[PDB]
Every structure is written in C-alpha cells, then in structure tokens.
Design a protein around this ligand. Sequence first.
Ligand SMILES: COc1ccc(C[C@@H](C(=O)NN)c2nn[nH]n2)cc1
Ligand code: NA
Ligand code: NI
Ligand SMILES: [Zn+2]
Length: 330
Amino acid sequence: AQNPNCNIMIFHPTKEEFNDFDKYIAYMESQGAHRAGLAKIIPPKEWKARETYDNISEILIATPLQQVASGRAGVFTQYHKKKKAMTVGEYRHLANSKKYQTPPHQNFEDLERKYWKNRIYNSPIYGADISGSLFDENTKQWNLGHLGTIQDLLEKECGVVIEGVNTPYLYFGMWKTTFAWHTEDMDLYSINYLHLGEPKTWYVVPPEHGQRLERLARELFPGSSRGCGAFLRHKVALISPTVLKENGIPFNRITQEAGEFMVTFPYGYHAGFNHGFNCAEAINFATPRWIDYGKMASQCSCGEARVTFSMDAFVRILQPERYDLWKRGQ
Ligand SMILES: COc1ccc(C[C@@H](C(=O)NN)c2nn[nH]n2)cc1
Ligand code: NA
Ligand code: NI
Ligand SMILES: [Zn+2]
C-alpha cells in the first residue's frame, strides 16, 4: 500500500501533466496521496492563474465576518459577527493596520507558536464564501471556474440527472483568520488556490482516522455534541496541534504559499489559519471514488449547518433514508 504513514505529499506536475485535471488527481491517488487527507500541488513554472493582481481592489466583501473566540487557547469555538461591507482595497488596508497586522516573527514555526498562544485574544475579520473567480478565462489548466461539475459526475456514475450548480468561492484573509475543523459538504473533495499574499497553515487528519478526531471533539465540546450528532458540520470548533498530540490523534501540518494548490480528499478533516493578508479561491469537486463517501457522509439536521441548495440533490439521491430529516433541518 502506498503512503502507509499517511504523509502529506507534494507534487510537481509538468506542463504536459497539467492538462488533464481528472487524470492527475487519479495519479496522485495511485501514489497514496489521499491517505493524508491533503496534498500540495505546485504548478509548472510556465503556468499562471492570471496576468496580474493589480485590479482586484474594487471586489466587494458584502458581509465581512469578525471571528470571535471562546474557550481556552488550544480548545475554543468561534462565532462570526457580521460587519459592514467593504471593498478588497479597504480590507487590505485594515489587514495591514497596527491592530490586525502580522507580528514580527522569525519563521513559520514561530508564527504558528504565536497563533496558538494568542489567537483567542483577538478577533480578526475575514471575507468568506464570496462567489466569484480570479482565474483568467484564457487559463486552460487547473482553472477552478472550468472544472467538471459534481452534478455531471453523479450523472455519469449513477445515471441520474440532477439540478444544481457548482461555482468557485473567494476568500480574503488576514493574520489569525481561522478555518475550523471540518470535512467538506457530503465529504466532497476540495481544491484551494492561494492567489496572492501571505501563507496559510493547514492541519489535516487522515480519512482513515477521522472518527478519532470526532471522538475527541465530542469529549472536548460536550454541550455541542449533545446538541447535534454532526456538530463539526457547524464549522466552529478549534483544537490545537498540542492538544491533538496529547490525545494521540494522527495528524499532519503544512504551509501553503501563494501560487500553490491544495487538494483535500473525501473525509479528510482539516483546519488552519492565515498568516496575513491573502486571497484564495476554492471549490468542491468529485471523482468516481467520492461516491461511496457521499453515501456515508454524516449530516447535520439540527439547523445550524445551512448549506447550498445544490446539496439537496446529493442527499436526495445518495441518502434517501436521511433526506426527510435533513430537509427539515434546512
Ligand atoms: C471557521 O471555519 C471555516 C471558515 C472558513 C472555511 C473556508 C476554508 C475551507 O476549508 N472551506 N472548505 C478555506 N480557507 N481558505 N480557503 N478556504 C472553512 C471553515
Ligand atoms: Na505524521
Ligand atoms: Ni475545507
Ligand atoms: Zn447541527
């Protein structure tokens, strides 16, 4: 078996290997990449997402979110307080202000230490789930707005045409902006491109060990667990690497830099944080191997995890027994 220790693998496709997206995902899995839950893909040197980022300042962040923590430094939840709209240029200025800017630091490890020590004492603001794309329409390879759709994958594998669409999202981050522990909706894959700015540090649990993280989370967030059997779906809970190690949870970490792609694999729990002002683009996708994960994915039906209307068809077709209860949640 390839990659038995479930290490995060890093790939360097040539320009020829970068033509056929589906083929390269399958190649990475042939090498065991999916066992880690996350892989990095460094594009060939000839490739670019777009010509420049000089003209992005007028994009609107209609509802910036202030991420307010509660708990202890290594075990906390966050809620999102809505703020007034601002442009990307205004957000970049805010991120660089004395209140929000990245502190002096020696290297990524020092910054990671500072994040886990001090995150809860600040409330950074970020732009999330903004429908749109920064790929140039003429970028033909790994253009996140031109991937095959999940609806077409389901139809090709299972024979059923379904409603729904599948478009990318933009994210604008700053120092300490945080993504809580989660898997994707319906345990889909995701792909994430860091277009511009400072890094993003990721943590990931191998899919084969996801239920170990779930068990720890139920212990550490006991009221949340009583409220919902799939509360990690709410995307609010953080657990530090120190606490994971103390509890024996298998995980890995890696830092993504501008110009790099990250792929998350079905049922790969992940979390992380931004180092400073940045802009990323991400979308969910499927392959034939996903279908079995989609059939088995847990669901939140308590009301908290509202999602896109595209997920209706996925539950309806893949999880008909669960559909009525889940639909009542939505
Ligand atoms: C508080 O929790 C969340 C906040 C934001 C995301 C979005 C995240 C991701 O992993 N989405 N699937 C991402 N971060 N950079 N680009 N995307 C996920 C969880
Ligand atoms: Na490891
Ligand atoms: Ni994710
Ligand atoms: Zn719930």
